Amino acid sequence: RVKMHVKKGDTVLVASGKYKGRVGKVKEVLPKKYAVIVEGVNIVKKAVRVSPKYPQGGFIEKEAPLHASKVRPICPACGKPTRVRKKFLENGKKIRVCAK
Amino acid sequence: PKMKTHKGAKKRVKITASGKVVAMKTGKRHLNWQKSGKEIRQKGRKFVLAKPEAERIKLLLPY
């Protein structure tokens, strides 16, 4: 709803910036931010556990957002923008020379 | 926004084909009683000079 875009929880290839060429699963989508997730962008956040119950929370720290225009879905073949087919009854998305 | 002609002059002074400004001689509408035949006669029209440039500018539409 004005929010909507390209992909959902699935395998997508990044073409981004730093993580250019990357192939990652489920993008865990926003779309408030038009952002996604993959295993692309990663950083360290500093911590001491929300409650020092199990002391430190840890230190590896997880994935940044990443603009949804950076990713590009994929199937039998590569990237491909999505196209949208009638189906004769409902409506699904098929990739250019492909399906789903 | 569009100039109006100044009726008080239109009403009392002709504009010639040169573009000179023509006015009647003043000075014989009641004065008389006995001024010479020369006086009272010598009132037909006349020119003016430098003061007509002014009088013309007010008869602006009639040219």
């Binding site: - | 009403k11 002074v13 002014a54």
Partner: protein, 146 residues
């Protein structure tokens, strides 16, 4: 043609006059030095002194107009047979409006300068002169109107 320098020729001059600087039209603004160059002044044309303009001159141009306004009366337009020389065949009002003179100006009267021409020429009147010159072949369509 090229793109630049179609450029205005010789003299366009859009350089009008601003008055603000140390050099040019300074301080008091390109004129003025005094009081009554300040946001209005009385005329002149007609005005001033508080003398009497010259509205000491006098409106002998009498016959200035009565209440219900003008009197409609048929109005006449001059045209010289000189001007007629141009065209041949037969000349009539409206035939003339579709040219330099008369136009809408109602009742045609041919008169005056130039030599006359062999053509019948409808008019509401002539000068004596122009009636005589037009003896050299040409018309007395006069009368007209109803």
């Amino acid at each position: 043609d090229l793109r630049p320098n179609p450029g205005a020729n010789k003299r366009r001059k859009r350089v009008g006059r601003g008055p603000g600087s140390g050099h040019g039209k300074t301080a008091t603004r390109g004129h003025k030095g005094q009081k009554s160059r300040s946001g209005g002044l009385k005329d002149p044309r007609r005005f001033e002194g508080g003398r009497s303009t010259t509205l000491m001159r006098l409106p002998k141009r009498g016959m200035q107009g009565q209440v219900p306004g003008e009197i409609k009366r048929p109005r006449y337009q001059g045209v010289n047979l000189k001007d007629l020389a141009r065209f041949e065949g037969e000349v009539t009002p409206e035939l003339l409006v579709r040219a330099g003179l008369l136009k809408k100006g109602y009742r045609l009267k041919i008169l005056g300068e130039g030599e006359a021409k062999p053509l019948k020429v409808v008019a509401h009147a002539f000068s004596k002169s122009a009636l005589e010159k037009l003896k050299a072949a040409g018309g007395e369509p006069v009368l007209l109107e109803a």
